[PDB]
Design an enzyme around this catalytic site. Structure first.
Site, mmCIF file in Angstrom:
data_model
loop_
_atom_site.group_PDB
_atom_site.id
_atom_site.type_symbol
_atom_site.label_atom_id
_atom_site.label_comp_id
_atom_site.label_asym_id
_atom_site.label_seq_id
_atom_site.Cartn_x
_atom_site.Cartn_y
_atom_site.Cartn_z
ATOM 1 N N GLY A 1 82.501 37.740 76.414
ATOM 2 C CA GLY A 1 82.781 38.994 77.106
ATOM 3 C C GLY A 1 82.728 40.185 76.170
ATOM 4 O O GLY A 1 81.902 40.209 75.253
ATOM 5 N N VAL B 1 84.823 32.850 74.346
ATOM 6 C CA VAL B 1 85.489 31.759 75.063
ATOM 7 C C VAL B 1 84.816 30.424 74.720
ATOM 8 O O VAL B 1 83.590 30.312 74.781
ATOM 9 C CB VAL B 1 85.603 31.993 76.596
ATOM 10 C CG1 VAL B 1 86.666 31.086 77.210
ATOM 11 C CG2 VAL B 1 85.909 33.455 76.920
ATOM 12 N N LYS C 1 90.131 31.128 73.831
ATOM 13 C CA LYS C 1 89.500 32.420 73.555
ATOM 14 C C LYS C 1 89.751 32.801 72.091
ATOM 15 O O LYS C 1 90.876 33.160 71.728
ATOM 16 C CB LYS C 1 90.038 33.498 74.516
ATOM 17 C CG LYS C 1 89.102 34.678 74.726
ATOM 18 C CD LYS C 1 89.635 35.611 75.808
ATOM 19 C CE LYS C 1 88.715 36.777 76.075
ATOM 20 N NZ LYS C 1 89.274 37.707 77.094
ATOM 21 N N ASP D 1 90.453 47.094 84.837
ATOM 22 C CA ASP D 1 89.074 46.605 84.764
ATOM 23 C C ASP D 1 88.874 45.354 85.639
ATOM 24 O O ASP D 1 88.909 44.224 85.140
ATOM 25 C CB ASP D 1 88.644 46.383 83.295
ATOM 26 C CG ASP D 1 87.229 45.858 83.106
ATOM 27 O OD1 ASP D 1 86.282 46.504 83.607
ATOM 28 O OD2 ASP D 1 87.072 44.802 82.456
HETATM 29 C C1 LIG Z 1 93.866 33.665 78.146
HETATM 30 C C2 LIG Z 1 92.532 34.284 77.723
HETATM 31 N N1 LIG Z 1 91.438 33.458 78.232
HETATM 32 C C3 LIG Z 1 91.203 32.187 77.530
HETATM 33 C C4 LIG Z 1 90.689 33.871 79.309
HETATM 34 O O1 LIG Z 1 90.914 34.937 79.868
HETATM 35 C C5 LIG Z 1 89.582 33.057 79.853
HETATM 36 C C6 LIG Z 1 88.253 33.538 79.794
HETATM 37 C C7 LIG Z 1 87.224 32.774 80.317
HETATM 38 C C8 LIG Z 1 87.479 31.506 80.915
HETATM 39 C C9 LIG Z 1 88.819 31.026 80.974
HETATM 40 C C10 LIG Z 1 89.859 31.808 80.460
HETATM 41 N N2 LIG Z 1 88.822 29.795 81.598
HETATM 42 C C11 LIG Z 1 87.585 29.426 81.932
HETATM 43 O O2 LIG Z 1 87.318 28.382 82.500
HETATM 44 C C12 LIG Z 1 86.645 30.447 81.559
HETATM 45 C C13 LIG Z 1 85.244 30.427 81.773
HETATM 46 N N3 LIG Z 1 84.701 29.315 82.414
HETATM 47 C C14 LIG Z 1 83.368 28.880 82.594
HETATM 48 C C15 LIG Z 1 83.156 27.490 82.755
HETATM 49 C C16 LIG Z 1 81.861 26.983 82.963
HETATM 50 C C17 LIG Z 1 80.764 27.861 83.031
HETATM 51 C C18 LIG Z 1 79.371 27.324 83.261
HETATM 52 N N4 LIG Z 1 78.852 27.855 84.535
HETATM 53 C C19 LIG Z 1 77.457 28.326 84.408
HETATM 54 C C20 LIG Z 1 77.014 29.038 85.703
HETATM 55 C C21 LIG Z 1 77.200 28.114 86.926
HETATM 56 C C22 LIG Z 1 78.638 27.557 86.989
HETATM 57 C C23 LIG Z 1 79.032 26.899 85.651
HETATM 58 C C24 LIG Z 1 80.964 29.244 82.893
HETATM 59 C C25 LIG Z 1 82.255 29.750 82.689
HETATM 60 C C26 LIG Z 1 84.428 31.585 81.337
HETATM 61 C C27 LIG Z 1 84.019 31.737 79.988
HETATM 62 C C28 LIG Z 1 83.257 32.855 79.619
HETATM 63 C C29 LIG Z 1 82.895 33.824 80.571
HETATM 64 C C30 LIG Z 1 83.301 33.683 81.906
HETATM 65 C C31 LIG Z 1 84.065 32.574 82.290
#
Ligand SMILES: CCN(C)C(=O)c1ccc2c(c1)NC(=O)/C2=C(\Nc1ccc(CN2CCCCC2)cc1)c1ccccc1
Length: 330
Positions: free
Chosen positions: A44, A49, A62, A163
């Site tokens: 992001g 992540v 993260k 946001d």
């Molecule tokens: C406490 C602070 N954190 C860790 C977060 O805010 C955070 C951020 C991101 C994620 C997450 C938590 N948990 C997840 O599963 C997250 C995420 N999960 C995720 C899991 C699998 C995919 C693969 N994806 C590819 C497109 C078709 C559907 C499958 C894409 C994203 C994520 C990671 C990066 C950008 C957008 C989503």
């Protein structure tokens, strides 16, 4: 942490506890230093992540850079010292600082979701009538809990997201939404009338920015202005959810708001000409007037895209209207 303890058991230990806060500081330090990193899942505006594994179970980590310490602390302080543990809010686990100086490792642990963000889910899959309501209700209930303020020390302060976008909202295994990334968020206490951040500059994605924010007319002293700005951003998210809803084959291709009016990565001046100057809003197609679910969503969208902040709907009002609509089909 004793032998035989799992991540699923740890979630129960903090949710059903006397205080609705996170796991102890020593326990949080142990979890982060035990997570086995598998692969980089995404990126992001702040940090990267990664997909991790704590005692076999899948987990989300993260990893923040040493330079972006402000984004790491803001998210960690909001997820911990408030008491906000909700079904439609990202399940926080741990926050830890490993090293010191230029090579400082800043970690943030939360629940893992296989489907990913709403942006990746909608671009890949087509939602049903019942499914469309489930995604909208969860997004409405999520921000309703954030804006809700419980006064009496034991409660929680009012938090504005600032946001809101499809990329920031994650979808669970059962087709339910959870609000994520609170790095740009602002806390507020009504008992003393104070806000933790420094209000002077614009924050978040330009595409999802409110007109009041774009033309500098927004009163940054008022906290309600930040609450109302999130409602407009939630309305843009509500536009793309109902757009992918198919009622017998009829559905539109997934596109971000103002795709035909603004290009990829827009400037402040370019977005101001469409939203503030020309007063243009995302197009609502004629096929949406066919069924009840698509018609109600379109009514909320126009009631969230107002030029005036005060005229817009409240987070609890969108939650209550969607709850009545869900009861019609179970
Ligand atoms: C406490 C602070 N954190 C860790 C977060 O805010 C955070 C951020 C991101 C994620 C997450 C938590 N948990 C997840 O599963 C997250 C995420 N999960 C995720 C899991 C699998 C995919 C693969 N994806 C590819 C497109 C078709 C559907 C499958 C894409 C994203 C994520 C990671 C990066 C950008 C957008 C989503």
């Amino acid at each position: 942490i004793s032998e035989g303890t799992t991540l699923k058991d740890l979630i129960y230990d903090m949710t059903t506890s006397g205080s609705g806060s996170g796991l102890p500081l020593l326990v949080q330090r142990t979890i982060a230093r035990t997570i086995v990193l598998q692969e980089s899942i995404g990126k992001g505006r702040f940090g990267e992540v990664w997909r991790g594994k704590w005692r076999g179970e899948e987990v989300a980590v993260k990893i923040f850079s040493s330079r972006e310490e402000r984004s790491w602390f803001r998210e960690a302080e909001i997820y911990q010292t408030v008491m906000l543990r909700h079904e439609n809010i990202l399940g926080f686990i741990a926050a830890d600082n490993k090293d010191n100086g230029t090579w400082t490792q800043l970690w943030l642990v939360s629940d893992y979701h296989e489907h990913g963000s709403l942006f990746d889910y909608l671009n890949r899959y087509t939602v049903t009538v019942e499914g469309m309501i489930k995604l909208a209700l969860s997004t409405a209930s999520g921000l309703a809990h954030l804006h809700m303020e419980i006064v009496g020390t034991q409660g929680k302060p009012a938090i504005a997201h600032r946001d809101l976008k499809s990329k920031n909202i994650l979808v669970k295994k059962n087709g339910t939404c959870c609000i994520a990334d609170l790095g740009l968020a602002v806390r507020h206490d009504s008992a003393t009338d104070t806000i933790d951040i420094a209000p002077n500059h614009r924050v978040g994605t330009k595409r999802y920015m409110a007109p009041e924010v774009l033309d500098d007319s927004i009163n940054m002293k008022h906290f309600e202005s930040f609450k109302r700005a999130d409602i407009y951003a939630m309305g843009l998210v509500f536009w793309e959810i109902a757009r992918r809803c198919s009622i017998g084959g009829i559905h539109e291709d997934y596109q971000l708001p103002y795709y035909d009016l603004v290009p990829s990565d827009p400037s402040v001046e370019e977005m101001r000409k469409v939203v503030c100057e020309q007063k243009l809003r995302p197009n609502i197609p004629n096929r949406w007037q066919s069924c009840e679910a698509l018609r109600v969503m379109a009514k909320i969208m126009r009631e969230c895209w107002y030029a005036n902040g005060a005229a817009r709907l409240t987070a609890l009002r969108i939650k209550k209207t969607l709850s009545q609509l869900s009861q019609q089909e179970g």
